[PDB]
């Protein structure tokens, strides 16, 4: 396990960006010092069903699609200062690149508009 640390890597890489993104932090109510300094947490789908295998734990649904790129569809949940948030990242593995390319990545926070940390190629160049 964890040998395919891509999800593991991406989780940390994805989570770091979302945790530290001001926009997301604002969504996450990440105002440190508001009531002392509060703690954030990040993990895959929590109690969704039973225990660990529930829905989407910290994983990327590895698909080696027609693209010729491994597709990383990864979601994880985080605890904000005041809310519990869900983070969804779509990455693709180039070929021999160190990390997969991030196509899209966004944060789902209850009561907050889904924030797109990373914008997918929504329009084909022209738009």
Curated annotation (Swiss-Prot):
One of its GO terms (biological process) is protein import into mitochondrial matrix. It is a single-pass membrane protein. It is found in: Mitochondrion inner membrane. Its main location: mitochondrion. Keywords: Membrane, Mitochondrion, Mitochondrion inner membrane, Protein transport, Transit peptide, Translocation, Transmembrane, Transmembrane helix, Transport. One of its GO terms (cellular component) is TIM23 mitochondrial import inner membrane translocase complex. Residues 5-127 are mitochondrial intermembrane. Disulfide bonds: none annotated. Present with 3770 molecules/cell in log phase SD medium. Component of the TIM23 complex, at least composed of TIM23, TIM17, TIM50 and TIM21. Interacts directly with TIM23. Interacts with TOM22 component of the TOM complex. Released from the TOM23 complex by the PAM complex, leading to protein translocation into the mitochondrial matrix. Essential component of the TIM23 complex, a complex that mediates the translocation of transit peptide-containing proteins across the mitochondrial inner membrane. Required to keep the TOM and the TIM23 complexes in close contact. At some point, it is released from the TOM23 complex to allow protein translocation into the mitochondrial matrix. In the complex, it acts as an antagonist of TIM50 by reducing preprotein accumulation at the TOM23 complex and promotes dissociation of the PAM complex from the TIM23 complex. Belongs to the TIM21 family. This is Mitochondrial import inner membrane translocase subunit TIM21. It comes from Saccharomyces cerevisiae (strain ATCC 204508 / S288c). The lineage of its organism: Eukaryota, Fungi, Dikarya, Ascomycota, Saccharomycotina.
